[PDB]
Structures are given as structure tokens and as C-alpha cells.
């Protein structure tokens, strides 16, 4: 949202478009997009602008009786207008005048996209009951020729036709019928193409990615039940969180609990993500979109795909009933007008990570979770056991 450094001592001071600001009062340059939005502001409104440092804690937020921050200085009237990007809280709104949206915003959380694929048995999912269709179908058709051989045992031969169905691999008792042999030739190339059906099925397994992890919204089974998860699911922002305060109004399962998971530092959130000691992280939504946007490597992902949580937007507020008030947001209007914001995607928004479509590749070994297909496979053991001992009951009477 904003950028700054020390004014370059090589030339002695700032360069490029950097805008200086004093700090107790040491002038220092500032960079970043919304700064340039302020540039474009006087680029019509024509009001001189001199940047200044912020003392503590972002914008003004109610501290004891008063907002602590930039909007505090607004209450202090320390400036005609204010800069910096925070979606105005109803409180912040109720405090004093604010701007029109500079860019969209919202509540959000994020974490590292790491490991998972498609869940097990998706191969079986490709069958689409056609496996059953031709299963019973070709079964009865097999019985048909079995009867046609006149010129249990034939049932066992149908089991051989199930080897014809499944991977051959049935050594027992080829039937003498030559017409029945061509009957095997029916399932030969056909069922061969059913092995092919398994092939392309496996392709769509490899193809048709998913990229889905847990996001339930403002709460979750892993959130609305904060103490339930054996490993703690940690997501949230740093102290004095405005959006957190909204959550502090919303649900206490975190504002209560997340104080535990509470952390410090802005990028230090992404750093702890590199540590990954905590499940996830929440921060300014679109800002977080820049967090994934600037990524040394591909790890993190927004909680959700960007489905908006507490959709919002920021801007440059000023005092209640200020001078620029009316036509200011109009300057914002034209600002959206020329598309120079779309240009500012360069200046800020457009990321190197991007690829919000591309999910990359989950390729890895077979998972026990992925082996769950074989789990449901082996599950039928006790079932066939129930049928078998059931036949023993058929032998009781």
C-alpha cells in the first residue's frame, strides 16, 4: 500500500518520484502507489501536499476516549486531510469524514498451500456407474453364451469373465467352447478398452486439478470450534487489528482465543508462515493479495480463493466538513476514469506471483489418504464374510 526509505544521501536527498516526510522532525522520502494517487489528486484539485510521518499504530483507533492514530491527529486536526489505506470502520466512519473507495478491500486470512490431491478413489469416481452397467450387463451376456455351449461351474466361468473384466489374471479353467472362446474375444478388445478407461481415468486424475483446502469463512469447524482442533489452527492479525476489531465485534472464539495465536510484524506474518508454526494468518484482504503477490516462493495461499470476507475499501480521509470534501471523491472518480489505476497495477497491484488460475502440480507419491480407495476395497472383506457365514446359516437349516 505504501513505501518509504531514507532520502538518498548519495545525491543527499530523495529522487525518482519519492515524496519526503519529516520525523521527530527529520524529513524522509516516501514511495508507493496510493502516494501517487495523492499525486494524481492535486493533479486536478491542485492542493499542495506535504507528507508526514505517523507516530504510532496506523490510523486513529479509539484508545481510551479517543482514537489513537492518524484519525487521532484528525481529531487533533493536525492535518487538513489524511493519507494511508484503511477501510473506514463504522466507528472510523462515525469518527469523522472519510474518502470514497480507493480500491476494494475486505476481511481475509491466508496460509501456505502445501499438500493434497483430489482425495482417494477419484479413479473409481470416473466410473460413473457404467462399470456397473456393463458389469451386470456383460455378466448376464456371459451366462448367455455359457448356456449356448450346449453343443456355478458355468458361473465360475463367468468369474473367468470377471478376470476378462478385471486385469485377466485368472488362471483357472478356460472353457472349451470355441463359440464361447469368441465370446471371450468379446470382452477381449472391449474390456481391453476398459483398461483404457482406467487409463484415461487416471489421466483425469492427473488432469483436472482441484486445489482445495479448508476455508469456511468467518468461522469454521476448525475455527467456530477453536479449542476442538487437536493441533491449534492459528489465523489472525497483529494487535490493534481494525478488521480484528470487527471480528472482535463478530465472534469471540478468536478475539477471545486468537490473542494466544496473536503475532507481531506485517511481513513477519509471512515469515512465521515460512516457519509455519501457526496454521494461517489474517490481514488486510487486498493487502494480503499483495502478500501472496510478492512471494519469494510459492507456498502461501489466501484463505479461500479470494471469496470476499467483509468486503471493504480504503482511501484518504480528511476532517469532517473539510475543504476538498465534495469534489475530492470526484477526483477519485476521474481517477478510476482514466484507468491510471489499471496502470498502477504496475506501480502496485499487478503481482509477479499472480497465476490465481494456475494451481501448479500436487504430484507426489501415493498417500495413505489416497490409499483410502484400497481401504474401501478391503472393507468388503467382512461383508463377503457376512454373506459366507450367512451361507453357513443356509447350512444350519
Amino acid at each position: 500500500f505504501v513505501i518509504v526509505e531514507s532520502v538518498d544521501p548519495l545525491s543527499g536527498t530523495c529522487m525518482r518520484n519519492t515524496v519526503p516526510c519529516q520525523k521527530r522532525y527529520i524529513k524522509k522520502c516516501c514511495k508507493g502507489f496510493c502516494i501517487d494517487i495523492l499525486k494524481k489528486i492535486s493533479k486536478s484539485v491542485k492542493f499542495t501536499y506535504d507528507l508526514y510521518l505517523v507516530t504510532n499504530g496506523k490510523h486513529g483507533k479509539k484508545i481510551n476516549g479517543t482514537w489513537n492514530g492518524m484519525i487521532g491527529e484528525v481529531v487533533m486536526k493536525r492535518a487538513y486531510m489524511a493519507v494511508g489505506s484503511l477501510t473506514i470502520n463504522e466507528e472510523r466512519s462515525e469518527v469523522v469524514d472519510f474518502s470514497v473507495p480507493f480500491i476494494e478491500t475486505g476481511i481475509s486470512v491466508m496460509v501456505s498451500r502445501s499438500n493434497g490431491t483430489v482425495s482417494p478413489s477419484a479413479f473409481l469416481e470416473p466410473f460413473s456407474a457404467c462399470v456397473w452397467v456393463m458389469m451386470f450387463v456383460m455378466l448376464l451376456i456371459v451366462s448367455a453364451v455359457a448356456v449356448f455351449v450346449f453343443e456355478f461351474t458355468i458361473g465360475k466361468a463367468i468369474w473367468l469373465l470377471w478376470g476378462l473384466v478385471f486385469n485377466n489374471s485368472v488362471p483357472v479353467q478356460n472353457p472349451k467352447g470355441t463359440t464361447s472362446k469368441i465370446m471371450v474375444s468379446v470382452w477381449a478388445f472391449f474390456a481391453v478398452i476398459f483398461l483404457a478407461s482406467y487409463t484415461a481415468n487416471l489421466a483425469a486424475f492427473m488432469i483436472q486439478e482441484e486445489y482445495v483446502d479448508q476455508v469456511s469463512g468467518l468461522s469454521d469447524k476448525k475455527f467456530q470450534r477453536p479449542n476442538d482442533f487437536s493441533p491449534p489452527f492459528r489465523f489472525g492479525t497483529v494487535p490493534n487489528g481494525s478488521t480484528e476489531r470487527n471480528i472482535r465485534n463478530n465472534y469471540a472464539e478468536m478475539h477471545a482465543y486468537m490473542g494466544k495465536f496473536n503475532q507481531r510484524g506485517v511481513d513477519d506474518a509471512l515469515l512465521s508462515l515460512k516457519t509455519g508454526k501457526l496454521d494461517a494468518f489474517i490481514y488486510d484482504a487486498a493487502v494480503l493479495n499483495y502478500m501472496a503477490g510478492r512471494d519469494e516462493g510459492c507456498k502461501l495461499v489466501t484463505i479461500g480463493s479470494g471469496k470476499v470476507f467483509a468486503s471493504t475499501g480504503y482511501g484518504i480521509a480528511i476532517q469532517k466538513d473539510s475543504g476538498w470534501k465534495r469534489q475530492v471523491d470526484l477526483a477519485i472518480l476521474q481517477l478510476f476514469g482514466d484507468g491510471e489505476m489499471e496502470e498502477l497495477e504496475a506501480l502496485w497491484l499487478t503481482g509477479i506471483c499472480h497465476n490465481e488460475k494456475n494451481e501448479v502440480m500436487s504430484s507426489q507419491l501415493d498417500i495413505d489418504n489416497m490409499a483410502g480407495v484400497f481401504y474401501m476395497l478391503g472393507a468388503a472383506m467382512a461383508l463377503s464374510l457376512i454373506t459366507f457365514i450367512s451361507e453357513h446359516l443356509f447350512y444350519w437349516q
Binding site: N89, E90, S93, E94, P101, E104, A122, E125, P126, F127, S128, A129, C130, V133, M134, V137, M138, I141, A144, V145, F148, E151, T179, I182, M183, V186, W187, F189, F190, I193, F194, S197, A200, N201, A204, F205, I207, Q208, G217, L218, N246, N249, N250, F309, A310, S311, T312, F336, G339, E342, K357
Partner: protein, 95 residues
């Protein structure tokens, strides 16, 4: 479409001046502040029917799967009718 084009927004009529003005603003403040917006997604947004693909995860295939294996089973009964009289060919020849 591919992406956003010149995002902006609208709402109830706003003109001249009304006591409804700053009030209504605060109403919005509750709106996004509360979830009755996000709730209303269920009333409208969250309501969804048509699915969303990117590639063609057609893996089901059962219709076209029948579109091969079904008529193939046509080839299967082709010996039910054919291999019948064929089973009567050398047989009936020596019958």
C-alpha cells in the same frame, strides 16, 4: 470474462440532501460491518446452480463409455446370434 473492467458501484438513489444521507451511510457501515450482506449472498450471491469448469473433467464418460462398450456389447451378442448358427455350422454339417 477474463478480469475486472473499471470497478465501481451503485445503490439507492442519492441526490440533493437528505437526513437519510449520513444515516444511510452508517446503514451501509452496518451492512458490510454486519453479515446481512454476506447473509444476503445466500439470498442471491451464494445461490448457484450452473457448475464451473476450467479444463474438461469428463472422467464420468459413462454416456460415451456406453458410446463404445455398449455397441461393443453389440459385438458380444453378435456371437449370440452369429456363433449360434456357427455353432451349428460344422455341427449341423456333421449332424
Amino acid at each position: 470474462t477474463g478480469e475486472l473492467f473499471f470497478r465501481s458501484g451503485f445503490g439507492i438513489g442519492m441526490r440533493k440532501d437528505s437526513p437519510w444521507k449520513q444515516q444511510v451511510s452508517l446503514s451501509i457501515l452496518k451492512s458490510h460491518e454486519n453479515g446481512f450482506m454476506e447473509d444476503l449472498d445466500k439470498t442471491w450471491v451464494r445461490y448457484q446452480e450452473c457448475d464451473s469448469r476450467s479444463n474438461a473433467p469428463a472422467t464420468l464418460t459413462c454416456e460415451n463409455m456406453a458410446g463404445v462398450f455398449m455397441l461393443v456389447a453389440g459385438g458380444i451378442v453378435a456371437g449370440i446370434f452369429l456363433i449360434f448358427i456357427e455353432i451349428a455350422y460344422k455341427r449341423h454339417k456333421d449332424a
